[PDB]
């Protein structure tokens, strides 16, 4: 069924499961024309496919020829977004293939189910959780790749980098939708905190910076305070009267759909 | 016209013969319905007064022998048989006519009603949904499941209505997939009519079937598949002209003929909307569409 707080622990047991996110996927800015109407203007978009377990992250580049001549965009971009998943399955060996595949949105059930119909096995969910992976693109590598491409492409991350060798699944999960979120809500102030510091670098092979776990920690608690301080803004709120209590309850009812 | 004697009537029940019904109390002396139409299959059917519990009744059609009614004490039922010996039969209705100890099928003139409910059903396509080869007639009830039902159990009392699941290999092309599940021209024309049914009068008649069980017995997977059967044509951009039409007062007679206490369990909210304001061919039925809205603006 669907994937929510109660069996969370779920994502990071030893069953295969991939996330699916859609929402990059077609992509357009909207302008006015010469003769005062309004048009669309696509651009590259991508499908984010990840592993929670693993880190691995299955980049599928869309290509802005992919929309030339199609109509109701909108709608070809789930069908087109769940045939390129049900192509990665079917590319995968048998034993690297997932057993569930957990949508970000509910719109993408019944593509993805339609196009793996010939995997009766392999579930298809909806989730809770509001998961911020539409701020992929506010990875500077990842948001560099896509807008680069001028053909189909797919590429492969590990977006958590090296964390897993000090880091459980569950911890480096959270790290992510933390950072994402963070991204997703205020990205100036987001990209500020992760670089404020030269000294801390991101290495060629990576995604995000070269912190030492302490810094982590800081890192962290300077990401849930931006955050806290969008949310005080939002709602005119004085988050400074608020106690930890109500900060917790704040946070697990702002991650909720 | 033809008769269907009853031996007797031991226990109270309602008697429905087609969309006709009459009480009959306990040991009255009761002894069948004579005048019914020849031409068409019928359904006599029962509900016992003491037990509501079951509908059951029988398809048959007069032309392919003679049917009698008699009480099961055993199986506690009204059961149909055949009698093979023909002069036998011929006696025994005549002294029941002149005793007048039957009901008689009350057709008036003006009145199609039947006809244009049964238009496309025969006996023998009954009998293939109804597997039951000893028998020339059909025996369905309140409970029966349906193929389709027991995959999702007695194989034997089934009704084996055709399958039809939009989200099957069966209706998606592969590399077909959005254009077969927007639009089902492919599942309906090549697979459904082509494939299995061959034409449109049979895929009518097993969909006029469902209704009929559906209504009369209060069968919900016949009423399952009855909204599947409509839906599959809706929910198609290219239907035959000619099959849009006759779908159009096929519906019409089904849903003037539905009694009205019976919409709220009869009707699929989210079918009919979906078939008369969403689908390809929500401008295509437009006698059913007004009869719905006047008599069941409720439901929309
Ligand atoms: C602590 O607030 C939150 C915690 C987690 C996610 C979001 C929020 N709040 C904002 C960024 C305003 C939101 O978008 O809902």
Redesign the pocket.
């Known amino acids: 069924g669907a994937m929510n707080s109660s069996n969370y622990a779920e994502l990071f047991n030893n069953d295969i499961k991939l996330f699916v996110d859609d929402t990059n996927v077609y992509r357009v800015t909207v302008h006015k024309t010469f003769e005062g109407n309004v048009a669309t203007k696509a651009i590259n978009g991508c499908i984010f496919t990840l592993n929670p377990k693993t880190g691995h992250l299955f980049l599928k580049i869309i290509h802005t020829s992919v929309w030339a001549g199609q109509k109701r965009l909108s709608q070809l971009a789930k069908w087109k977004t769940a045939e390129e998943v049900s192509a990665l399955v079917r590319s995968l060996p048998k034993e690297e293939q997932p057993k569930q595949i957990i949508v970000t949105r509910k719109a993408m059930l019944d593509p993805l189910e339609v196009h793996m119909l010939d995997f009766p096995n392999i579930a298809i969910r909806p989730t809770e959780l ?1 998961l911020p992976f539409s701020a992929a693109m506010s990875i500077d590598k990842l948001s560099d790749v896509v807008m680069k491409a001028t053909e189909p492409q797919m590429v492969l991350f590990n977006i958590y980098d090296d964390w897993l060798d000090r880091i459980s699944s569950y911890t480096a999960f959270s790290r992510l939708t933390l950072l994402l ?1 963070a991204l997703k ?1 205020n990205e100036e102030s987001a990209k500020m905190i992760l670089l404020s510091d030269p000294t801390i670098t991101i290495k060629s092979y990576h995604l995000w910076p070269s912190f030492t776990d302490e810094q982590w920690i800081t890192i962290e608690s300077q990401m849930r305070d931006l ?2 301080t ?2 005080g803004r ?1 709602y005119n709120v004085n988050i400074s009267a608020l106690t930890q209590t109500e900060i917790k309850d ?2 697990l009812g ?2 909720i759909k | 016209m033809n008769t269907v004697p009853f031996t007797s009537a031991p226990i109270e029940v309602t008697i429905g013969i087609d969309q006709y019904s009459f009480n009959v109390k306990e040991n009255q002396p009761f002894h069948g319905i004579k005048d019914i139409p020849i031409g068409h299959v019928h359904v006599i059917h029962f509900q016992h007064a003491d037990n509501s519990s079951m509908r059951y009744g029988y398809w048959f059609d007069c032309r392919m022998g003679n049917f009698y009614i008699q009480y099961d004490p055993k199986d506690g039922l009204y059961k149909m048989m055949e009698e093979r010996d023909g002069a036998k039969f011929e006696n025994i209705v005549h002294n029941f006519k002149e005793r007048q100890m039957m009901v008689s099928y009350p057709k008036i003139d003006e009145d199609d009603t039947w006809y244009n409910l049964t238009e496309f059903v025969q006996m023998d396509k009954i009998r293939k949904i109804v597997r039951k080869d000893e028998n020339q007639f059909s025996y369905v009830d309140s409970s029966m499941t349906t193929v389709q039902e027991n995959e999702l159990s007695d194989p034997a009392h089934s009704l084996n209505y055709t399958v039809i699941n939009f989200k099957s290999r069966e209706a998606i092309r592969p590399g077909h997939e959005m254009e077969d599940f927007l639009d089902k021209s492919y599942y309906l024309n090549t697979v459904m009519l082509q494939g299995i049914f061959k034409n449109s009068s049979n895929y009518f008649g097993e969909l006029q079937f469902a209704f009929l069980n559906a209504m009369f017995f209060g069968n919900y997977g016949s009423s399952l598949q009855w909204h599947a059967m409509i839906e599959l044509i809706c929910s198609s951009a290219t239907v035959p002209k000619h099959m849009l039409d006759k779908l159009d007062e096929i519906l019409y007679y089904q849903i003037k003929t539905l009694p009205e206490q019976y919409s709220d369990i009869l009707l699929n909210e989210r079918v009919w909307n979906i078939c008369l304001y969403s689908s390809f061919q929500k401008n295509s039925l437009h006698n059913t569409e007004k009869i719905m809205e006047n008599k069941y603006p409720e439901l929309l």
């Open positions: 509001r979120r809500t955050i806290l969008e949310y939002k704040i946070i702002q991650n």
